[PDB]
DNA sequence: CTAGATCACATTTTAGGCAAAAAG
DNA sequence: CTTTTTGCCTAAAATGTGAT
DNA sequence: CTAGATCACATTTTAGGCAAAAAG
DNA sequence: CTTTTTGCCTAAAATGTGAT
């Protein structure tokens, strides 16, 4: 397993913005997120460039990434 | 943080590139090194008539114009010219040189891009001398997958790019170039619509 | 006398190579970089089918085995095969980077070569993309103008080659390189017997 | 014009047998040695692979080869 | 033989700057 | 009020066509 | 369209080691 | 006497052919 993919959305920290969406497309937790891909995001009402740029730089910083392929789930 | 790089830098004269203008001229006269802070750019050369052809596209933390760095008067051998934006640092063969005696660290980093690049290109001789034309192409579809600005897709990586580029990155005519895609499609390895294009199974 | 060089050697242990021995297996794990002491050497690649082809022929003072010194467990890129019989200094990546830091001078002298390799090669490519078969000859045949082992020749320079190898180098059917050169040959450009070829107007 | 290419070929000290084949084909002076192409040299007589090869190597030591193209020649 | 190049031009697709609209 | 998403727009660039 | 690839095999060419011959 | 050139030799490698 891993640790971080454990945690609520909140621990990213995000703008208001992008924290809505994310709330409203049934994605609660963080490992919920590294799976999701970037064009798949994107389509989501309210999310454009710069709320899909904020989302793949807080996880960069922090390790991860979007695309992510897991196992083990719940 | 990362102290080499940072150095390295403060040593350095900014400038930036509008995109698509052009940063090196094929044949100048060669007395300085450029490294890429921000941005991507186009690596190309030209036969007589204006033919073009792609060697590889260089991103965030690339080198740029060292090939007359190591023999005096030499001339630069290819077009470098921005793909995106670039916002790029810039250094003189004089200067450059008094650094690496202090920190040969420096030009290790360099010349460790320098191999990868043989590497690479050594492979597309290998691509031209052995793939036909259907098969270039599906390897240089497969390394845009590895690229940073690809990005994630549910059935694979997706990318963003014209045909007639690709005839000068695979070298054959765009009219080709197209005519692979609508069959790369009835084949499910691709969906294409327009620059959008989706590569199966990669990811 | 060269010093830089000559303390270079005395670190080294020499090895000689028959002929047509093979140095570096493309594939294999890379550990060790090799220097050509005195001889000619031939870097080539391979298909899956078997079917070779040449990037480039070093001699006396090249160096070889390098590209994997920069990252590590990397693979070796190529076959590097012995075309004549050589002597081969050999040492470690363990110890060369030792060395670097005692004389950075020595890393120069190789990254040196590295660029100019990357210009012969990043133009075969042009060859490639750009000129006919009946062109890409004519270029390989004036290189070879260039090269050590060349002889002068009244008419122009001349060499010792078969059709065979030709096109390994660029990268076509030996019964095609065969057909151009008793065009060349009416064409008055060259004189062709045997292995034994005048390059008209080098020199 | 040139300094060493006005010496007789004596001045290159060569072997007996590389000495007589060149004396026997009216090459007097180094001048005409370094003008002289590799292929021409081997058929002559008496004048095989070393001794071609020493005159290559006399010469390559002391800055000249074969093959050069001159002017001003007497 | 097979695999590509080639032509001109009617139609399709893209870049990217702005404004209205929605979200905060 | 600002910030960010979306729809909208046109000149310019990209494309398919297909017999030889 | 154009420029090359391809097949098998009868004939030609090369490498290179030795010995006789010539030179010293 | 040695050193170096030349002719000589055969298995193995290199080649032309040419219609599709
Ligand atoms: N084959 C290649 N792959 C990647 N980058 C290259 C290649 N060839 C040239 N370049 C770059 O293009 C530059 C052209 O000018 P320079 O010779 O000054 O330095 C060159 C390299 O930085
Ligand atoms: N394009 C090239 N031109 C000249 N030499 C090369 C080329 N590509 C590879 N080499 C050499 O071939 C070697 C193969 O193994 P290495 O990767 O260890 O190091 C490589 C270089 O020394």
Same mark, same amino acid.
């Given at each position: 397993?891993?640790?971080?993919?454990?945690?609520?959305?909140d621990?990213?920290?995000?703008?208001?913005r992008?924290?809505?969406?994310?709330?409203?497309?049934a994605?609660?937790?963080?490992?919920?997120?590294?799976?999701?891909?970037?064009?798949?995001?994107?389509?989501?009402?309210?999310l454009?460039?710069?709320?899909?740029?904020?989302?793949?730089?807080?996880?960069?910083?922090r390790?991860?990434?979007?695309?992510?392929?897991?196992?083990?789930?719940? | 943080?990362?102290?080499?790089?940072?150095?390295?830098?403060?040593?350095?004269?900014?400038?930036?590139?509008?995109?698509?203008?052009?940063?090196?001229?094929?044949?100048?006269?060669?007395?300085?090194?450029?490294?890429?802070?921000? +941005?991507?750019? $186009?690596? #190309?050369?030209?036969?007589?008539?204006?033919?073009?052809?792609? %060697?590889?596209?260089?991103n =965030?933390? /690339?080198?740029?114009?060292?090939?007359?760095?190591?023999?005096?008067?030499?001339?630069?051998s290819?077009?470098?010219?921005?793909?995106?934006?670039?916002?790029?640092?810039?250094?003189?063969?004089?200067?450059?040189?008094?650094?690496?005696?202090?920190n040969?660290?420096?030009?290790?980093?360099?010349?460790?891009?320098?191999?990868?690049?043989?590497?690479?290109?050594?492979?597309?001789? +290998?691509?031209? $001398?052995? #793939?036909?034309?259907?098969?270039?192409?599906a390897?240089?579809? %497969?390394?845009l997958?590895? =690229?940073? /600005?690809?990005?994630?897709?549910?059935?694979?990586?997706?990318?963003?790019?014209?045909?007639?580029?690709?005839?000068?990155?695979?070298?054959?005519?765009?009219?080709?170039?197209?005519?692979?895609?609508?069959?790369?499609?009835?084949?499910?390895?691709?969906?294409?619509?327009?620059?959008?294009?989706?590569?199966?199974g990669?990811?």
């Amino acid at each position: 397993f891993d640790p971080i993919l454990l945690r609520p959305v909140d621990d990213l920290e995000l703008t208001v913005r992008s924290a809505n969406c994310l709330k409203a497309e049934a994605i609660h937790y963080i490992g919920d997120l590294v799976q999701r891909t970037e064009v798949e995001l994107l389509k989501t009402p309210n999310l454009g460039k710069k709320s899909l740029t904020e989302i793949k730089d807080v996880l960069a910083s922090r390790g991860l990434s979007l695309g992510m392929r897991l196992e083990n789930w719940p | 943080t990362d102290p080499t790089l940072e150095w390295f830098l403060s040593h350095c004269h900014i400038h930036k590139y509008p995109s698509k203008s052009t940063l090196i001229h094929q044949g100048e006269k060669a007395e300085t090194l450029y490294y890429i802070v921000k +941005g991507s750019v $186009a690596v #190309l050369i030209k036969d007589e008539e204006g033919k073009e052809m792609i %060697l590889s596209y260089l991103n =965030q933390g /690339d080198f740029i114009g060292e090939l007359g760095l190591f023999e005096e008067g030499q001339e630069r051998s290819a077009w470098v010219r921005a793909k995106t934006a670039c916002e790029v640092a810039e250094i003189s063969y004089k200067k450059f040189r008094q650094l690496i005696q202090v920190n040969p660290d420096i030009l290790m980093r360099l010349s460790a891009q320098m191999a990868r690049r043989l590497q690479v290109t050594s492979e597309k001789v +290998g691509n031209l $001398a052995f #793939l036909d034309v259907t098969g270039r192409i599906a390897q240089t579809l %497969l390394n845009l997958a590895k =690229q940073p /600005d690809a990005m994630t897709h549910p059935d694979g990586m997706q990318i963003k790019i014209t045909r007639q580029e690709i005839g000068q990155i695979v070298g054959c005519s765009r009219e080709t170039v197209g005519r692979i895609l609508k069959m790369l499609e009835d084949q499910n390895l691709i969906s294409a619509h327009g620059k959008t294009i989706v590569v199966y199974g990669t990811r």
